[PDB]
Amino acid sequence: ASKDPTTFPLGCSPDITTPKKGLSMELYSYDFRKKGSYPCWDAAYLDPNYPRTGYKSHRLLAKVDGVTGNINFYYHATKGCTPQLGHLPASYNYPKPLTMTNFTMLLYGYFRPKVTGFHTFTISADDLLFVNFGAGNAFDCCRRDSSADHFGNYQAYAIWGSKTAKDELTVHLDAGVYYPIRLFYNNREYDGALSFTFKTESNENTVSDFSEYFFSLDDTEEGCPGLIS
Ligand SMILES: CC(=O)N[C@@H]1[C@@H](O[C@@H]2O[C@H](CO)[C@H](O)[C@H](O)[C@H]2O)[C@@H](O)[C@@H](CO)O[C@H]1O
Ligand SMILES: [Ca+2]
Numbered sequence: 001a002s003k004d005p006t007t008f009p010l011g012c013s014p015d016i017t018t019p020k021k022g023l024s025m026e027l028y029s030y031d032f033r034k035k036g037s038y039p040c041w042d043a044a045y046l047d048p049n050y051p052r053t054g055y056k057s058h059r060l061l062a063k064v065d066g067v068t069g070n071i072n073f074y075y076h077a078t079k080g081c082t083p084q085l086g087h088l089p090a091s092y093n094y095p096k097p098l099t100m101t102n103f104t105m106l107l108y109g110y111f112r113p114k115v116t117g118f119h120t121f122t123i124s125a126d127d128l129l130f131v132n133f134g135a136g137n138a139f140d141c142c143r144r145d146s147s148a149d150h151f152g153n154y155q156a157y158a159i160w161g162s163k164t165a166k167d168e169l170t171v172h173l174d175a176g177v178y179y180p181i182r183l184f185y186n187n188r189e190y191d192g193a194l195s196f197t198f199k200t201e202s203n204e205n206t207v208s209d210f211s212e213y214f215f216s217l218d219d220t221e222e223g224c225p226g227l228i229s
């Protein structure tokens, strides 16, 4: 698939193996600058290659499976320029404290729609959430191994304090097809927040609980390109 973001993204058709519930998550540290710097937070999170290669230089905290449910959070800090502990919601399947003021997080896997039609995803973040969506744009169907670092221009992005603090992505999707998805998050300092929800043209319900929507698929030899059309 093309890497470019599109309104009609390509999806994937898994084989016999049952998709596993939830997304994969990786957590990385994101240190402050040395005492007395102005500002105190590291600006690395906005380097253009930070979401591709830069984050990998940071200390790996965790890699977990099975992230699903409601993945939204709001972490309230009490002090600027200070690492403070907190916990992710239970949905993240990570039962240890981390520096919720300052960390990087990567989620990847597949989104399976329940209805065929236009979906509008709405995102917000403190500090940053970058979203790739579709085969190629995120990664290749059951070939994430060979394509994970080759994602394309973001389908949506949100940066706290910017002219784009919230964003939307509208895409036409087919029910029961599995669409590659990559979420890249950072908190630089202080409060952190992530909101990821959607609506469809089918009804006026907002979906915030991804239990029946987020899945993981094993990579395979020849891939699992979408077979529908
Ligand atoms: C703009 C700014 O620097 N605000 C300071 C606070 O830090 C920011 O807080 C926002 C949320 O309001 C966001 O989380 C951002 O990442 C942070 O940089 C904080 O340092 C506060 C300490 O009391 O001072 C504000 O001025
Ligand atoms: Ca913040």
Ligand code: NA
Pocket (backbone or CB within 6 Å): 015, 016
């Ligand atoms: Na097979």
Ligand code: NA
Pocket (backbone or CB within 6 Å): 029, 030, 031, 032, 083, 099, 102
């Ligand atoms: Na740190």
Ligand code: NA
Pocket (backbone or CB within 6 Å): 026, 056
């Ligand atoms: Na990694």
Ligand code: NA
Pocket (backbone or CB within 6 Å): 167, 168
């Ligand atoms: Na909007």
Ligand code: NA
Pocket (backbone or CB within 6 Å): 204, 205, 206
């Ligand atoms: Na409702």
